[PDB]
Write a protein that binds this DNA or RNA. Structure first.
Ligand code: XG4
Ligand code: MG
Ligand code: MG
Length: 430
DNA sequence: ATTATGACGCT
DNA sequence: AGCGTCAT
């Protein structure tokens, strides 16, 4: 009743760039704009692997993880941009720099948590409080929310998408009690106004479009963001959660798309997030552990406490390359040359990171996969990272992995290596 | 022969 | 510390 916390204390937004790498390539090459197009890495094997897809190309069924040759079967006029190759490997520097452009604009409005190359969480609670003081009890015009959807509306007592969007927004705004500056729905609405401004600033200053979700926590903001991509933002209120979750497959919630979500489904015999409400917190903890159980008990009621971390920069800087099937490394000189290529890219990125961000990595993590191991990493070893020198880190990485070589022969490497991965971690201010 | 990362939990 | 999970 009056003591049951409802998880409405914060206003959190999630901003995700639409088909990000495609937009980066379309900005650079206007010939790609407003076309079915995709970004690929490599080319020789099946045309390259697609990692990003414009919405025009998605209409033909083109997806991430497709081979370009197969995508061209679905969409013969598909345009393709390839990721840069440097030192024999894909080099994603252009997209990391574009990401910094967007993150620096977002940081003007609030402290952000960089959650990936193309998305950031924003804690707008304080900014909403400020804007509410400025508004002085003045209602919010629909003109301030020109690209906002209100999830669950319109309801009750009408054919095009924009018309539907505007009907829902009108219902929401008419139901608002703009007197109470502590009303969570009002706070969400003001948060959406601010996110409209942030998205306008990103597009004006970078050319990139994005979508966003606004809700009371990170998981609902992320879910909301997905509901109306591209180039739109969605407000998911606390009140919208029961209907939203009543048909929402468990796997759609971030962190439940893998084995844990499958076990929720199988152990409990349920399909949708809303069905979780019928179990006690202790029941969920008994099946899925204390932390997972408490998190599920709260999440299915729309409640989640994970804070928006003040972290604009990635925590690690890493370099990896697969060597599939027959290109796997089977000689000591091969392993050395590729460790050096990866180490040279890492040294470049680390040096730029130190200059930009006033920090130094102190630990080097070396991960490999061996032929016939279905795991991501077959072996992980750390060593000290004391200087930004590629020859040094590649020799150290070799020193920490060389005992994996089964070959009694010193020239060969067996079993051959199907993946090398160098990761700089444990940053300290410098 | 999806690939290249990044975050984070577990023990 | 090293491994597993999840994301995409
Ligand atoms: N190297 C690599 N990059 C990837 C991979 N998957 C995604 N990316 C890169 C390419 C993506 O552009 C970028 C952001 O990932 P999203 O936000 O999940 N997809 P997007 O922004 O394209 O479309 P949406 O409008 O649905 O948000 O990450 C991958 O497996 N490997
Ligand atoms: Mg995106
Ligand atoms: Mg994203």
């Amino acid at each position: 009743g009056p003591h049951m916390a409802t998880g409405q204390d914060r206003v959190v937004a999630l901003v995700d760039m639409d088909c990000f790498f495609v937009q980066v390539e379309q900005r650079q090459n206007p010939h790609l704009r407003n076309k079915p197009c995709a970004v690929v890495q490599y080319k020789s094997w099946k045309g390259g692997g697609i990692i990003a897809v414009s919405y025009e190309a998605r209409a033909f069924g083109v997806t991430r993880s497709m081979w370009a040759d197969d995508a061209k079967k679905l969409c013969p006029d598909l345009l393709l941009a390839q990721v840069r190759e440097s030192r024999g490997k894909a080099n994603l520097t252009k997209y990391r720099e574009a990401s910094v452009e967007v993150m620096e604009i977002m940081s003007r409005f609030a402290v952000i948590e960089r959650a990936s190359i193309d998305e950031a969480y924003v804690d707008l609670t304080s900014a909403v409080q400020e804007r509410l003081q400025k508004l002085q009890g003045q209602p919010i015009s629909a003109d301030l929310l020109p690209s906002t959807y209100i999830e669950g509306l319109p309801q009750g007592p009408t054919v095009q998408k924009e018309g539907m969007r505007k009907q829902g927004l009108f219902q929401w705004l008419d139901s608002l009690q703009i007197d109470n500056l502590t009303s969570p729905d009002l706070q969400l609405t003001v948060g959406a106004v601010i996110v409209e401004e942030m998205r306008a600033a990103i597009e004006r200053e970078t050319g990139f479009q994005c979508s966003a979700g606004i809700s009371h926590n990170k998981v609902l903001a992320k879910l909301a963001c997905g509901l109306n991509k591209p180039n739109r933002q969605t407000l998911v209120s606390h009140g919208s959660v029961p209907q939203l979750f009543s048909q929402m497959p468990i796997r759609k919630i971030r962190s439940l798309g893998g084995k844990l979500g499958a076990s929720v489904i199988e152990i409990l015999g349920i399909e949708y997030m809303g069905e979780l409400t019928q179990f006690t917190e202790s029941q969920l903890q008994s099946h899925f552990g204390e932390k997972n159980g408490s998190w599920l008990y709260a999440m299915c009621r729309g409640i989640e406490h994970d804070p928006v971390k003040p972290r604009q920069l990635p925590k690690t800087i890493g370099c990896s390359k697969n060597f599939p099937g027959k290109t796997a490394l089977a000689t000591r000189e091969q392993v050395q040359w590729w460790l050096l290529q990866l180490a040279q890219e890492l040294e470049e990125r680390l040096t730029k990171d130190r200059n930009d961000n006033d920090r130094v990595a102190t630990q080097l993590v070396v991960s490999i996969r061996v032929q016939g191991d279905k795991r991501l990493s077959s072996l992980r070893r750390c060593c000290a990272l004391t200087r930004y020198d590629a020859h040094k880190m590649s020799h150290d990485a070799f020193t920490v992995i060389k005992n994996c070589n089964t070959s009694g022969i010193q020239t060969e490497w067996s079993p051959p290596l199907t993946m090398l991965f160098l990761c700089a971690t444990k940053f300290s201010a410098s």
